């Protein structure tokens, strides 16, 4: 950064085409020590993500963070998951009884595969003492922190021992940062991801703004290993909320016209990320990191 | 490219005028042995494109081009057309039953005056290898080659043996691509063919995109020998799809409103694109190579 | 040209306020031998102005100019208008009993002030032979030439002999040049007059895109001796057409609202554009010449 | 100036949140010899403001500007306003009784503590005048004077004696100055700002082109002082103007809908300026003006 652009300004070139269906394109991405089908999570937001969903994903192969909003039923959550043979990935803060959450878990002998530190301004001395503070209790914990809107956040969140880091303040559809306090990546969301992965060492979760399937493979183009999407899930029969009538659900976090059960929106994902790998003149999700890319005029629309 | 923009961006700049009437304005093409009377094409689509349409077009020396859809039908298409003293124009893939009807027509001595190979995405050997055996199997056939998006694929279809390349990935009005993939000429379509044209040694169809007649004007000056327009030509009455009721048209690829005879749009093309030549400072429709141009700001609207 | 832009980027900078009250500005011009109240001009249109009007202006020291729609009517108007002490002004074309009708303009001893050459695409030879053919049979004629949209046709114009020149391709709000056939100043009309105006020995006739009065000043500041007006002067009572019932009028060339009388109209430009004046820093029309202005980004909306 | 742009053009740069809670952050300010609670005034209309609110505002430490509408009421609201404790803040013109106004208020023995010079096109010897009879018959005023747009207008001013000046030629919701004239930092106030800013020795009140909360802060990061806020201000229980039935108030200058208790709104202000504080990295006000920033493409929306 540089040119300052968002999801709607950038077109990706396509490459000569290798395969014969994009059925054999490989989408499969990696976190850790965990291999997921989709470079894709749901936000980790109570009006999207619950123990059911958590479960589904978790059972199929896709990776999932679990939303902080009841902080009491996450020791059970990790041990069912974890007598499931499945992944526990949850989300912690740094207020106050939480750092003896985790200190609880310590005791407990339960180690989360993940945790993600999920502050709205991430970037600060509450997000780098959680991180130490965890990599002291429970250091086979894959830790992702954030928000974060800058390469210096990102540094030094790595440098405090993050595992991953979540770019994005303010892109969400029902985020309001960028109206109240005129401050963040909304607006430029893909043009701030660029530039924050352009100095991390570290798996970059991009965080808001994805408005179509599309805006995942540009989000991989731009260097993020995982793209987290709240607004794309929100409103499926498996999701959190209620109905309402035609059809309705709700999502807000801390009016939406309903879309059907979300495993068809996941294959839908899955393939249309599968066509971008054809475009991207390769084979594997990777591909789409080389691809050339222009800025155009008006939008994409 | 260079500066990217597209159709809405462009106005062209008017020449002295040298003729009393648009009347005396030619625009006329040839594309291999043949001239037709506009240089503009119905989209190769079921929903735009049947043998009722293609009858007329080819009895008024408008260059048509049929879609791929029953290709059962293809071989007796052919015939009656041939018989009748008109070009026989069709499309074939590359999968794969198709190497054998090329293989076919061989044998039954039957040689279409074109044939396009139309696949969304033609950068490929698929696309190579079908050209090659085409040329191999029926070498009097003028071939049609694409989709492509670049200068990079456009020679090497050239170079496979294309007689003519399709260009345009993603710009259609039906076609989301651009949202599902997050590639191609779509929001860019005029400047990525400004683009490919520079590079291309056979006539490029300019594929997607026309949303008024002077973008007919426009695709000319950027290098276009001929014009595929799907949307401007849905829902005439000639129009494949039931109309209902006021009045509409169903329009789709592999809702809109009623648009009166075909001919009526054509001569109205003509006329419009005479209009063009008047204000290209000419008598042909070359003129309009050669005008200056300015990319406005917000746009022609 | 240089940077494009049109009426809505463009924002003028105030200079200090030399004037107690706007009233003491004054937005006289002149075009040839005469003085006007405002540097605005109808249409010469049937949907604009009618004699009554033309009368009305006259008879108020308003610059006017007829339409041509009835040809036959023109040599008892300019008797009228002259009997009575005011200007006749008319168009004329080039086809092709105009040419004996100016000659039997200096048969009948009958010499208009101001005559205008008024067609679509000016630039021709057709234009300056009626132009020649004007200064030869009435010299006395003030000749307005167009329409133009280049630097070029406005020198080969001013050339042939015309007395002002009259800029504008297409940017009619009911214009639809632009649309058919990709060619003109639609879009960036007051970057084509900035232009057209660098190179011009005459007036300039703004023609066309005025969308407020602020546009008139900002015609003033890029080079316009006069401006004219169409859509803002449609849908007056005094106006040409039929009026439906609330309320509404046709306005068409060669479905608005009703608009109030056309005194108020121009009594309301007349004190903006001294309002424009006292902003530009001084007491006269002129004053806006020299202002400095910016692009804005969005619009001025 | 520079690149123009404004409010909605303007994304702030997140530095490293040094604060718990954001109220820990110190939104106050202080002009001339008095202390603020907010960087924010209501616009000094009778649309916005009256004797009520005034007060209310005074009584807790909010700035408030009365507008000129009733004179003749000036002279008992300064002495209400001073007999009560609090700070008397009204407006002035030039014309022309109200030279005796400022020379009955130095008789009278009032010296109100601000005084706003409040002209349309404040950039004239008109508004130098005022201020130079102020500075000598109530010297311990403070002055406020305009309203400019240019570093040319404030020096002027500044050097007249004015001891702040008002920022802003047309960028009002209900202001219609950009459209009848073609003049003002409509379309470009946050840039106008900037780049007045930049010329200034005394403190600058940006007025007009607020439509979210994030713009206070914006407008900050640019240089003002104090924020002149009508749109967002009208519409309250508290506000001038009458309520219809939903609900609605007027509001106009010299159709929109109910807004609650200007205390909800005022504490809404300060509490986001609070997070805007968090995100500039700081404790107080001044944070924010060291931030980066970045011009996106589209808007922030
Ligand atoms: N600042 C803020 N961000 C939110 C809130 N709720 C959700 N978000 C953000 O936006 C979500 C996803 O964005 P989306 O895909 O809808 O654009 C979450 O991942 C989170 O980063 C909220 O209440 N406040
Ligand atoms: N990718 C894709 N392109 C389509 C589809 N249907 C039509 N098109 C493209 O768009 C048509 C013409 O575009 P239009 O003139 O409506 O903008 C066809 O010529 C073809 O290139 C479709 O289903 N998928
Ligand atoms: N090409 C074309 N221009 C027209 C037509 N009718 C009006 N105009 C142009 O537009 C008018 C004024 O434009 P307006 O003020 O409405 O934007 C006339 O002065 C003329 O230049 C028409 O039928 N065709
Ligand atoms: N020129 C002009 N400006 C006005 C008028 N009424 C209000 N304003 C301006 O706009 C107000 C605030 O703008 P807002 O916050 O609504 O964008 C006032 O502070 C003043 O500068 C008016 O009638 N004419």
């Known amino acids: 950064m540089g040119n300052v652009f968002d999801y709607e300004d950038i077109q990706l070139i396509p490459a000569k085409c290798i395969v014969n269906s994009r059925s054999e394109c490989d989408t499969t991405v990696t976190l850790g020590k965990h291999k997921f089908k989709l470079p894709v999570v749901p936000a980790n937001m109570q009006t999207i993500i619950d123990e059911r969903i958590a479960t589904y994903l978790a059972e199929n192969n896709y990776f999932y963070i679990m939303h902080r909003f009841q902080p009491e039923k996450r020791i059970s959550f990790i041990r069912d998951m974890q007598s499931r043979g499945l992944i526990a990935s949850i989300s912690v803060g740094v207020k106050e009884d939480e750092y003896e959450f985790v200190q609880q878990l ?20 509450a997000v780098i003492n959680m991180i130490q503070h965890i990599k002291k209790h429970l250091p086979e914990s894959f830790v992702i922190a954030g928000n974060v809107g800058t390469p210096e956040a990102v540094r030094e969140l790595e440098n405090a021992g993050a595992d991953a880091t979540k770019v994005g303040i303010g892109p969400g559809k029902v985020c309001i940062t960028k109206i109240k306090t005129g401050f963040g990546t909304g607006g430029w969301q893909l043009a701030a991801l660029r530039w924050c992965a352009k100095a991390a ?9 994805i408005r179509t399937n599309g805006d995942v493979a ?10 987290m999407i709240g607004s794309l899930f929100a409103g499926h029969e498996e999701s959190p909320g209620e109905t309402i009538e035609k059809l309705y659900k709700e999502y807000f976090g801390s009016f939406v016209e309903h879309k059907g059960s979300l495993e068809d929106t996941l294959i839908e994902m899955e393939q249309d990320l599968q066509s971008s790998i054809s475009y991207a003149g390769g084979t594997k999700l990777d591909s789409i990191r080389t691809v050339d890319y222009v800025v155009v005029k008006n939008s994409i629309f």
């Open 106 to 125: 310590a005791a407990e002998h339960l180690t989360p595969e993940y945790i993600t530190i999920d502050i709205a301004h991430g970037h600060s001395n």
């Open 201 to 209: 060492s570290k798996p970059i979760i991009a965080d808001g703004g």
């Open 218 to 227: 540009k989000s991989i183009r731009f260097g993020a290993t995982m793209v």
